[PDB]
Design a binder for this molecule. Sequence first.
Ligand SMILES: Nc1ncnc2c1ncn2[C@@H]1O[C@H](COP(=O)(O)OP(=O)(O)OP(=O)(O)O)[C@@H](O)[C@H]1O
Ligand SMILES: Nc1ncnc2c1ncn2[C@@H]1O[C@H](COP(=O)(O)OP(=O)(O)OP(=O)(O)O)[C@@H](O)[C@H]1O
Ligand SMILES: Nc1ncnc2c1ncn2[C@@H]1O[C@H](COP(=O)(O)OP(=O)(O)OP(=O)(O)O)[C@@H](O)[C@H]1O
Ligand SMILES: [Mg+2]
Ligand SMILES: [Mg+2]
Ligand SMILES: [Mg+2]
Lengths: 152, 232, 727, 405, 390
Amino acid sequence: LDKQIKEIKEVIELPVKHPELFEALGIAQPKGVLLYGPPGTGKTLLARAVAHHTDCTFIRVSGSELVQKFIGEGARMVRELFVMAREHAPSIIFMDEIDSIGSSRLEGGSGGDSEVQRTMLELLNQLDGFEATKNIKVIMATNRIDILDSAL
Amino acid sequence: TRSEYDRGVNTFSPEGRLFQVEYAIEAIKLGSTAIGIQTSEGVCLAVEKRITSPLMEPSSIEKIVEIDAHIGCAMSGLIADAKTLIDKARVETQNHWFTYNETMTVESVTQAVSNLALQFGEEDAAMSRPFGVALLFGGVDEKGPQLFHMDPSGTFVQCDARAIGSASEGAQSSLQEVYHKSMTLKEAIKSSLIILKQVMEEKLNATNIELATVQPGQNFHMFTKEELEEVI
Amino acid sequence: ELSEEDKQLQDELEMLVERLYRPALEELRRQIRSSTTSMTSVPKPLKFLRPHYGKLKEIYENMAPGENKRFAADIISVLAMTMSGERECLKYRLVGSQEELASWGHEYVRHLAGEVAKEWQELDDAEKVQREPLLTLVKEIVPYNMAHNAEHEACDLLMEIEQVDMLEKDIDENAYAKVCLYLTSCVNYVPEPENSALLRCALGVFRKFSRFPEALRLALMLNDMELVEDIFTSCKDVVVQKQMAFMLGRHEEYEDLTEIMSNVQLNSNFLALARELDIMEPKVPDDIYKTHLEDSARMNLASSFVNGFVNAAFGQGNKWLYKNKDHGMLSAAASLGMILLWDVDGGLTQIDKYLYSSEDYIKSGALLACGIVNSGVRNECDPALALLSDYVLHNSNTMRLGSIFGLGLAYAGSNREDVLTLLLPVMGDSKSSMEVAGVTALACGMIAVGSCNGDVTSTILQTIMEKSETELKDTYARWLPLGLGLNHLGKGEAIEAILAALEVVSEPFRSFANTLVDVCAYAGSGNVLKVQQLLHICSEHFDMGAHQGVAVLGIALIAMGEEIGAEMALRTFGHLLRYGEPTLRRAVPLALALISVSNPRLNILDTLSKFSHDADPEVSYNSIFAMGMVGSGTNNARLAAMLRQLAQYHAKDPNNLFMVRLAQGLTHLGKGTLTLCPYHSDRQLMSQVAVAGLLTVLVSFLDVRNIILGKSHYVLYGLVAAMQPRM
Amino acid sequence: PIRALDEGDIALLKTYGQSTYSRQIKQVEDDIQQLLKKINELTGIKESDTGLAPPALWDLAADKQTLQSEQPLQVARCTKIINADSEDPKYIINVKQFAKFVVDLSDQVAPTDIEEGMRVGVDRNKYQIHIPLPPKIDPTVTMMQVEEKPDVTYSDVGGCKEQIEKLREVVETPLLHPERFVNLGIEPPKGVLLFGPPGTGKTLCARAVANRTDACFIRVIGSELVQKYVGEGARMVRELFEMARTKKACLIFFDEIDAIGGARFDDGAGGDNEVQRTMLELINQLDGFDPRGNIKVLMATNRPDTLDPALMRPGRLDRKIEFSLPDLEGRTHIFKIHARSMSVERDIRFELLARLCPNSTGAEIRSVCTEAGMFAIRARRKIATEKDFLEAVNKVIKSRYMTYN
Amino acid sequence: TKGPDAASKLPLVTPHTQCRLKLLKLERIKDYLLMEEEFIRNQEQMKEERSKVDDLRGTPMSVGTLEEIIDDNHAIVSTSVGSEHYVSILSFVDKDLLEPGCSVLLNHKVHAVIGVLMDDTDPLVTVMKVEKAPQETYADIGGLDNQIQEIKESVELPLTHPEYYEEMGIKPPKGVILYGPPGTGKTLLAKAVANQTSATFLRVVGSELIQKYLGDGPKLVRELFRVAEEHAPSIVFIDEIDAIGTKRYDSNSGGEREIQRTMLELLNQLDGFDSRGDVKVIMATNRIETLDPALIRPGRIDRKIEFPLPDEKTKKRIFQIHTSRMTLADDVTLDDLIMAKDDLSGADIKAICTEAGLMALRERRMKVTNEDFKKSKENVLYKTPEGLYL
Ligand SMILES: Nc1ncnc2c1ncn2[C@@H]1O[C@H](COP(=O)(O)OP(=O)(O)OP(=O)(O)O)[C@@H](O)[C@H]1O
Ligand SMILES: Nc1ncnc2c1ncn2[C@@H]1O[C@H](COP(=O)(O)OP(=O)(O)OP(=O)(O)O)[C@@H](O)[C@H]1O
Ligand SMILES: Nc1ncnc2c1ncn2[C@@H]1O[C@H](COP(=O)(O)OP(=O)(O)OP(=O)(O)O)[C@@H](O)[C@H]1O
Ligand SMILES: [Mg+2]
Ligand SMILES: [Mg+2]
Ligand SMILES: [Mg+2]
C-alpha cells in the first residue's frame, strides 16, 4: 500500500507540517480523505499508523457513535466534536464506516432514516460550510462507497 | 381521496363522477381558443394559432378542418384525438351521403361523432380513455345554419354562439354580451375577431388566426391570406 | 529516497569537490543546467553541494587569479543566494564576467534584484562609487524583466529607495498598461515627494508614447503650473486639445482655446444634459420634504436652503424674500442668485433689479448672487468685477461680509493679480470688523488655492500679528489660518518657516492655526507619520477642543485618497467618538462627511444615525449635517425616510428641525445633477476647486452653535461654491 | 514513480522559486492577524444595559428596602381552610413544586379576605400569611391575545366569496345581529376548519376577521402549547379557555394545529404523548360536560388528513371550509388587487393574465405581480406593462406542449 | 429593533498577484491598525455615589422571569426552581422595560427587582450569530451571473436602493432558495452576500433546529427569528434545509412529529398571522423535490434559484478563478477540460486545480503543466447503456 500511504501522507501530513508549499502554489488546502476497499485491506490500520505517526490531535468517531436515540442529539454531538477538534487543532478526525453515520439520502417522512440523515447533514456542513475550517483534517473509511452520499 | 376513484374510467366515485371524464374536459382547456358563431346568414369560425416560431408551416397546426362541403370543424385539444374524431366525422358524412344520397344534417353528424366518443371502455368495440378533444361543427343543414358543440364526454348541443379552449371562461362572457339573433356574417366575423384579440397574448395580425365560414350558398370557405389582411 | 542515478550524480559532485581546475570549472558550471532547466525547481546540485558550501567558500577565499577563480564564482554565488554569500561575492562573480543571466534563471534574476536592493538600503550617500556598477547592473537586468513580463518587479527596482527614469523611458511601446495603472496606484499610495517623482515618471512615459490624456490629469497631481503649460504646449492635435481644454476648465485656433478653458459654454453643456432626462421644475419645499406623509424665519431659511440646493443653476423672488426677521438675512437672495448660478445673461438683469432695492440684506445678497453665479465661468469681459471693486468699500459688516465672499465666488482658483490687489490692501481690517476680517481672509485664501502667494501669506501673517488678546479667543477669528491654509496646499515640508513664524502667537490660540495650516498642507496624498501626528494631537487629554476638532478634520482630509485608508479611518473615527470628549465627538461627523461626501455608504449612514439622537445638541447637529453631506447630490433612498423619522423624533426641537430639514435639502440637492465630491478626475485629484469650499464649510461647522446659530450663514453658499455637476 | 519531499528538497521548495519580498509580506500578514487579535482583546466588551436608571428618579437611603423584603408568596394558593375550626382558622397553602404547609395570619387586618383560593402572601421561614394577591394570568396566555389589529380587510381576500361569506356568517353574524338566529330557531355553529392547498388566503381571512371583529381574539401560538413538563400544555389549554370564558365573546384562532395533534396511535410515539394529551384537553374544552359559552373557533390546517377524528367531528368544528385554487374570475380579482398599488399602464389585460395562470394559488399571483415589478426595475423602466407581466408569469407559474393544440 | 449589527471587515487590498504594490497596501493596513491600537492604549492608559449604590446592589445578582408586575414598587418575579415571589422594586431601574416574560435581575438575599437584562438571547442562537466577515466577495463566483443578479435584487437592492420599489408600491422578495446538485456555489453566493451586506448575517443549519427536549425546537426557531427581527434588518441563511424540510407525513413516532413541529413553527415565523419585518431568508438544499409545499410556497420563499452544473463558459471562468493565484506553464491550455462534457462542478474544478498543483509538487516543481492537469482530473473525478439510443 505504498501509493496509498503516499497519497494519504500527502493530504494529511503535508498541509499541517508545511502549509507554505500550498500557499506558494496558490492551491486551496486539501481537506479530507476517504478509503475504499474490501474488508481486509487496511482502511483502519493505515489510520492507526497515521495516528501513531502524527504530531496532531488524533480523534476517532468510528461506528454508529453519532446515532443516538434522542432527537436533536446527533447534530449536537458532531458539532461539539468539531468544536473539540478546532480547540485542539491541528487535528485528524477518523471516521470508520461512514456509511453507517451518513449514506444515501433516501426519502423520509414515513420509512426514511431521517435522524441518521440529519447527522450526516450536520457532518457535511461542518466539514465544509459557512465559516469553514482551518487545519482540521478528516479521514473516512468505507467498505463499499456505492451508497455513500454525493454531497459527502 | 381521489386516489382509487379517479385512476379508472369505470370506477364510480362516492359523488357519482367520472373523474377521468372531468380530467379530459380539463385537457380540453389547454388548447388554442376557437369561437364559432351561427347567424341567419351562415356560420363563422375564428381560431387562434400558437405558432411557436417560423419554420413551422401554417398547414400543420390544423384548428379548422373542412367537414364535407357544408360543415367546418374547429378543434380544441389533443391533436391525435382530433384527427381520429375528424376522420370519424368525414367517413360518417360520406357514408350517409352514399347510402341516403343527401347531406347529413349537423345534428346527425355531431350525434355520431359523440357516439364514437361515448365508448370509453365498453367491452363491445377500441379506446380506454375519453377522446380528449372538444369540437365545434359549424354547418348549413335544412334548418338553416347551425352550430353544434361536442365535449369529450359525448355530449353535444346546439349553440348560437360558442367559444372553446384555453380562452373559454374568458370569452363566453364576451359572447354573452355581444351576440344577438339578428346578426349578419360580417358582424359575426368582426365580433369573433374582437373577442379573439381580447383574449390573445400575441397581437392578432393575420398569421396568428384562422377564419372560415360555411354559408347557405358557397361552400365552406377558408379565408386566404389577402382576406385575412382585409378583415384585420 | 536518493534514487541510484541521483546518488551517482551526488557521488560525481563529491569527487568534483574532493579533487586540474579547468575541468572542475567546466563541469561545475555546466551543472547549473539544473537551474537553467525550463521545467524544474529544487536544482539538485543546489542542496547537493550543501555540505561542501563551507569548503567552496574557504577555497574561494584562498583562491587567486588564473585559470580558476573565474567561473567558480558563479557556483559560489548560486550556492550563496541559496544560503548566505551576499553581494560582495555576487559582484565578485559578476566581475567574473557573467552578468548576462541567460545561463541562469528567472529565480536568480529576482534574487539578484533583491540583493542589489538590500545593499542599496544598507549603503548611504557615501561609497557612491559602488552604485555606478550597480546602476549598470540594474540597466542590464531591466531589459530581461521587460522580456519576461516581470513588469511589477522592474517597477519595483525602479521605485526602490529612489526614482528612476531610464527604464520607463526604455519600456518599449503598446504594452504600457501596467506601467500606467500599476504605477498610478503606487503613486496614489507613496509617502514622500518621490510621489511627484513617480508622477512625472509616468508623465514622461505618456509623453514618449505620444498619448497623454492621462498626464493630462497627472498635471494637477504635479503641483507645477509650469508643467501644466509644458503639457499644454505640444498639443499637436486640436481634437485632443479640445478635450484637454474642457478638462482644465472643469478643474493654433486661439479663438476657442481660452473660451473652453474659461468654460463660457459649460452652462450650455449642463443645460443640454439637463434637457437629457429633463427635471426642470420650479418646486415647493414640502415635495422635497413629505410633510403630507407625516411662518418662522427659521422655516423660511430652511425652505430657501433646500430649494436652492435642489434647483441650483437651473435659472429658476423679492416677494418671498421679504419675510425677514433679524436672522432673516441675505440667505434667500443668495438662494435666488444660486438658483440662477452660471446664468450671467439673466443674472445681470435680475441681480441689478434686486440690488436697486432695500437695505443691506438686499444688496449684500445681490453681490453674493453675482459672485456665486460667476463661480465656475470666466470671460475677458470680467463680470461683476466693477460692482465688487466700486461698491461697499466702507468699514462695516453685512456689506463687505457678503461682498468679499462674492468676489471669492467670482474668481476662486484663479490667482489673478488684479483681484489679489483688490483684496489684499482691503484685508486691513482692524479698522473694520472681526467677521469682516475673517471673510476677507476666506476670499483671499479661496482665490489663492494653494498658490503659495507670498503677498497673501504676508497679509494673513500681519493680520494675525495684529492681536487682541480677548478677541482672539472669543469666536469668529480663525479664517486668517483658513486663508493661510488655502494659500498653502500640499506643498510638502515647505511649511516649517510659516510654522516657526506663527509659533509667536499666544498658547491657548494658534493650536487651530497650526493644525489648520498643516491640514490644508499635505493632504489626500496620505502620510502615515502625518496622520500619526494628527491622531496624537487628538489623543492628548485636556481636563483645545477645537484643536482636536481641526485634528479630526485633518485626519479626514488626509485620508481622502486611498479607499483602504478611508475605511480604516472610518474605524478610527468610530473609536474616537466612542472613547472621545464632546469636542471630539462633534468633530467626528465632519471627518466622516469629508471621507464620504455624496457617496452614501450604509456603514457611515448607520454610524451617524446611531450617534444622532445624542444628549449634546451640537453632536446631534453635526451628525445630521454629516447625513446631509453623505447624501448630497444623490437623492439616495432611505436617507430621507430615516431622516424624517429623526425629524418626527425631534418634532419640537427648533434647531434640530432646521438642520435636519437642511440635511433633507442636501439629500435632494441638485436632483442628482451636482455632486460635492472632490477628486473630479480618475477620483485622483485633490481638486483645488471645491476643496476650499468644503474645507471652509467643515471648519465653520466645527462650531455650529456659535456661528451657524449666530449672525452668519454664508457657509452653505460656500458649500455651493464647492458644488459641481455630475453629468 | 512517486517521490516524497525530504531533507533539503522541502526547503528548496519555498526558498528557490520565491520573491525576495515574500517573507516580509508573510510576516506582516501574520502580525496584522495577531494585531487584530490584540485589538479585539483590548476592546470588544460592552457595558450592556442591566436596566440601570437615569438620575433624578432614584432613591437614596433605600435601606428600608433590604430591611423589609423577601416576601416568598406567589407560591401560596390556599386549598383547604381546614373548616376554620371557628376561631384560629389555621389556613393551608401549596407552594407548588416545593411543599404544602399549614399557616396562620400575621398583621393581616381582615382575616377573612383569603377566599380559600385567593393566592395569599407567605414568608420564608415561618410561612404566616401577609397579603393577598389577585388571580394568576400566565404571561403567555395574556400575550397570545392579539392586540394589534392586522392591516387587511374583507376587500383584499380576492377570489373567495363563498368561503368569506361562510366565515363571516359563523364568526360575525351571530355576534353582531343575534336576533335572526334566535328568531328562526337555529343555534349558530361554533367551529370552522379552514383547509385547502398550501397558500390560498387562509391566514389572510383570519387576519381580516381579526381586523373587523369587535370581540376577543386569541391567535394561539402553536409552539406555545408544546412545552416540557408533561401536563403544562394541557394546563395552557385550560387557562386559554378560562380566559375566553372570562371575556364576553371570544374568537380563538388555533393555527397550524397539525402540530398540536394528528392521530392518537402511539406505537413509538409513546414519548410524544404530551402533545396528544394537550390535544385531548383541547377536545374536552371545545365540547364536553360543560357549556363552552360565546367561544367560536376558526382552526386552520393545510393538511386536515392526519387530524384526529375526535377533533374533526362536527361537534367542535361545524363549518369545515375548503378554499379552492381560485377560478378565472377569482384570479382576475387577485391580480387586480395585487396590481392596484403598482405603477402599471392603464391597458393591461388582467383577464388575460388570469387565463395565463392556470390553477395558480393567490400566493403565486402575488409572486407574479412582484416579479413583473422586478423585471420592470431591472429593465430600468418606471412603468411595467403587460409584457412585463407575461415575463413574470413565465417565470413564476410554470417554474413542450406540441400535442395540445 | 435595536438596529443592524453586520460585521467588521478590514479593507481588501485590490492586488492579489504577489506585488510590491500589495506589500505597500498591506503595510498601509498595518500602520492604520497600529495607529488605532496606539490611540486605544495611550488614551485609556496615558489618559462615587453610583459606585456605592451599585455596591449596595447585590454582588451575585441572579436572574428571574418577571410575571404580573403589581403596584409601583412591588413586582412579582420568579426563579429557576419553579418558585416565584412578590419582590420589591428599587429606585435603580429605568422602569417601563419590565414586561411579562422579561428576564429580570434580582438580588441574591433580598430578592428584589434590581435589573432588567434586556439582552438575553439564547447561547444556541448567539453562537450562530455571524460577526466574522468571510473573504468570499462576488469575485470568486465564476459565472453564475443570473443567479447573482437575482440574489442581489432579493438581498441588496432593498437596502442600497429603497426607492425603486416604493416608486411603484411593489414590495421586495422575502425569501430565496438556492437548490441544486452537490457543489455549485449555493454557499458561496451566501458568503458573498455576507461580505457585501451591511446587514446582520445569521448562520442557520437545519440539523441545529432539532432539539432534544420536546418542544424546544419550536422555541429555538422563535428565538432565532425574534433575534433576527429585533437585532437587525438582517439575513438568515438556513443551510441544508433538507435537514428538517421533508414533506409532512402522518408519521407514527415522536421524533418525526417533533421535527414537523419545528417545521410548522418555521412556517409560522416566515408567514404567520402577524407580519414579518426586514428579515430576508436564504435557504439552501441539494434536493428541492423532497420539501413541503408549505415552505416552498411563494409567500415565504419568493424566489427559487437553480444552481445547474455550470455550463462551458462558466466552467472556463471557474478555472480562471481557481488558477489565477497559481504559477501556470505556458504549455497549459485550459480548454482540454472545458471541451469535454463530463459533469464538472465548481468544487470539482477547485479540486482539479489543487490536485494538479500537488502532482507538480510531487514532480518536484512549483508550476502546473498540461500533463499534471490531465492526471489531476483523472485521479479526482469520482464516478444509458451503450446502443440503447442511436
Ligand atoms: N496491506 C496490509 N498490510 C498489513 N496488514 C494488513 C493489510 N491489509 C489488511 N491487514 C490486516 O488487517 C487488519 C487491519 O484491519 P483493517 O484496517 O483492514 O480493518 P478496517 O479498516 O476496520 O475494515 P472494515 O471496515 O472492513 O472492518 C490487521 O490484521 C492487518 O494486519
Ligand atoms: N385568494 C386570495 N386572495 C387574496 N390574497 C391571496 C389569496 N391567496 C393567496 N393570497 C396572498 O397570499 C398571502 C396570504 O397567504 P396565507 O398566509 O393566507 O396562506 P395560507 O394558505 O394560510 O398558507 P400556509 O399553508 O402557509 O398556512 C398574501 O400575500 C395574500 O395576498
Ligand atoms: N462559481 C463558483 N466559483 C468558484 N468556486 C465555486 C463556485 N461554485 C462553487 N464553488 C466552490 O464551492 C465550494 C463550496 O461549496 P458550495 O458552496 O459549492 O456547496 P453547495 O453544494 O452549493 O452547498 P452546501 O455547502 O450547503 O453543501 C467552494 O470550494 C468553491 O470552490
Ligand atoms: Mg474497518
Ligand atoms: Mg398559514
Ligand atoms: Mg455551498
